[PDB]
C-alpha cells in the first residue's frame, strides 16, 4: 500500500465524491468506457446524461479558478479588450470582462493553458472557468463587429 498514481479519471471522481455529487455505479458505467478509449472521462459521464457543467465546476476547484455561472448577465469593458485582443482570445481560449480587484477578471473555459498566459500577459489578471457554450457567446459580446 502507500503506492498510488491516480489518473484524470481520479481527479474527476475524488472531487465528485468529496461532495457526493454522483455515485460509484455512475463512475463505473463510465470507466468501461475509458478502458475502450482512454479518453476523459469526463466526457463520458455527461454521454450517461449527467451535465456537462459538473464537469467544469470540478476542473475549477482543481486548477483553482472560480467556476462562472454564465455570460448573459456580463458586460465585457473596451478597457479589458485593450490587453487580451480577439486574435489573443481565440489563440488562448481567454476573454477579458473587465478590471476587479486592480486586476483584469479573464473567463476561459480552456484554462489548460491559464499558467502559461500569466507569464506571457506578466501583468496583473485574474483568471475564471467556464463552459465553452457561454464562452462562444461571451467572446462576440467582447468582440463584437459593426
Given at each position: 500500500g502507500s503506492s498510488g498514481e491516480g489518473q484524470k479519471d481520479l481527479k474527476l471522481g475524488e472531487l465528485l465524491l468529496q461532495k457526493g455529487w454522483i455515485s460509484r455505479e455512475a463512475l463505473e458505467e463510465a470507466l468501461v468506457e475509458q478502458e475502450k478509449?482512454?479518453?476523459?472521462?469526463g466526457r463520458i459521464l455527461v454521454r450517461?446524461?449527467?451535465?456537462?457543467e459538473a464537469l467544469y465546476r470540478a476542473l475549477a476547484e482543481q486548477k483553482g479558478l472560480e467556476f462562472l455561472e454564465s455570460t448573459e448577465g456580463i458586460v465585457p469593458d473596451p478597457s479589458a479588450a485593450l490587453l487580451l485582443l480577439r486574435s489573443d482570445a481565440l489563440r488562448y481560449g481567454a476573454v477579458p470582462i473587465g478590471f476587479q480587484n486592480g486586476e483584469v477578471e479573464v473567463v476561459l473555459?480552456?484554462?489548460?493553458?491559464k499558467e502559461a498566459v500569466a507569464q506571457l500577459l506578466n501583468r496583473p489578471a485574474r483568471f475564471y472557468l467556464a463552459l465553452p457554450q457561454a464562452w462562444e457567446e461571451l467572446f462576440r459580446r467582447a468582440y463584437p463587429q459593426k
Open positions: 478509449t482512454g479518453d476523459l472521462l450517461k446524461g449527467l451535465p456537462e473555459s480552456d484554462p489548460r493553458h
